[PDB]
Ligand binder design. Structure first.
Ligand SMILES: C=C1[C@@H](O)[C@@H]2O[C@]3(CC[C@H](/C=C/[C@@H](C)[C@@H]4CC(C)=C[C@@]5(O[C@H](C[C@@](C)(O)C(=O)O)CC[C@H]5O)O4)O3)CC[C@H]2O[C@@H]1[C@@H](O)C[C@H](C)[C@H]1O[C@@]2(CCCCO2)CC[C@H]1C
Ligand SMILES: [Mn+2]
Ligand SMILES: [Mn+2]
Length: 294
């Protein structure tokens, strides 16, 4: 029914055009991307088990031309396998093009392209920070609600080669075993505090070794001792997350037991931060590709 190759073709057709140029897909096509990807997300585990080689990206926040630059620098699917950590919409000027290209690739390469849920893939959040407004202006609210139903089915975490735990926010004082994550039911909005909330909102903190207070007004912060206990209990080597804007695009925390990735250069057009993508080769060696704020 859905012509994925044509959709991708039109979305990529703007490579080279002046940044900011829109790609206006038909309402039916976008709705189809949501419904089809939703089916795929539900068919795969909520806790993904992936293998390198892989390219991992952090927050994109509707900066579509920067997403294009990422693919330009890392290789357009299926040239390279990808895992995004969430926060595809809000703040930026082109959340629509951004999320549609990502969903399109998920449908086109379901086994080589993966997307995790960020806190911005939650209705209460993308309703206020831009996505709703973009949908209201370019399409309609019914379509925005359709996106919400899609987002409610996104997976929550992934483990790369049994060594790298990936999630959007961070750890939770309720997280004792991976099975707790696998048992999370979808579709799900994030109505209550707890495990899922923390996985989407928590942040690492340098000042405390254990659990601390989070300035976001939700969830908690976690220190190096918490991370160490986590990694050892599940025989992991690193936690890879996003959620926090970092000046260089990537930054290590908790004595390098954790790395934060942010892929949207000059966030909100008010930061001079760079964007970064982390490459994981087949020998489990990590390298970082930086996107200078252009
Ligand atoms: C979003 C957020 C948080 O993350 C944010 O955290 C804080 C701590 C660190 C963080 C700083 C971020 C900066 C780098 C950016 C840079 C720029 C240029 C703009 C700005 O942008 C922030 C929002 C956003 C999106 O851009 C983000 O970057 O986070 C707000 C402050 C702005 O100066 O700060 O600011 C404090 C303010 C807090 O404000 C909101 C928070 O009130 C949201 C609230 C908790 C939510 O509660 C509910 C109910 C409970 C469960 C969760 O859902 C419903 C929905 C919503 C009301
Ligand atoms: Mn986030
Ligand atoms: Mn973010």
């Amino acid at each position: 029914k859905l012509n994925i190759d044509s959709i991708i073709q039109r979305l990529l057709e703007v490579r080279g055009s002046k940044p900011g140029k829109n790609v206006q897909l038909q309402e039916n096509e976008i709705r189809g991307l949501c419904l089809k990807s939703r089916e795929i997300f539900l068919s795969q585990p909520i806790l993904l088990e992936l293998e390198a080689p892989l390219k991992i990206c952090g927050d994109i926040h509707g900066q579509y031309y920067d997403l294009l630059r990422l693919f330009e620098y890392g290789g357009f699917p299926p040239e390279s396998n990808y895992l995004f950590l969430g926060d595809y919409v809000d703040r930026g000027k082109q959340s629509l093009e951004t999320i549609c290209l990502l969903l399109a690739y998920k449908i086109k390469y379901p086994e080589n392209f993966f997307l995790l849920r960020g806190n911005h893939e939650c209705a209460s959040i993308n309703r206020i920070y831009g996505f709703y407004d973009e949908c209201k202006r370019r399409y309609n609210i019914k379509l925005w609600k359709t996106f919400t139903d899609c987002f409610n089915c996104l997976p929550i975490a992934a483990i790369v080669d049994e060594k790298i735990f990936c999630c959007h926010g961070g750890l939770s004082p309720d997280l004792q075993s991976m099975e707790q994550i696998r048992r999370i039911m979808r579709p799900t909005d994030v109505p209550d505090q707890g495990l899922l909330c923390d996985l989407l909102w928590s942040d690492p903190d340098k000042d405390v070794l254990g659990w601390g207070e989070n300035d976001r007004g939700v969830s908690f912060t976690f220190g190096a001792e918490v991370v160490a206990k986590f990694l050892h209990k599940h025989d992991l080597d690193l936690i890879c997350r996003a959620h926090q804007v970092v000046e260089d695009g990537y930054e290590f925390f908790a004595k390098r037991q954790l790395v934060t990735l942010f892929s949207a250069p000059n966030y909100c057009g008010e930061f001079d931060n760079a964007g970064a993508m982390m490459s994981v080769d087949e020998t489990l060696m990590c390298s970082f590709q930086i996107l200078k704020p252009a």
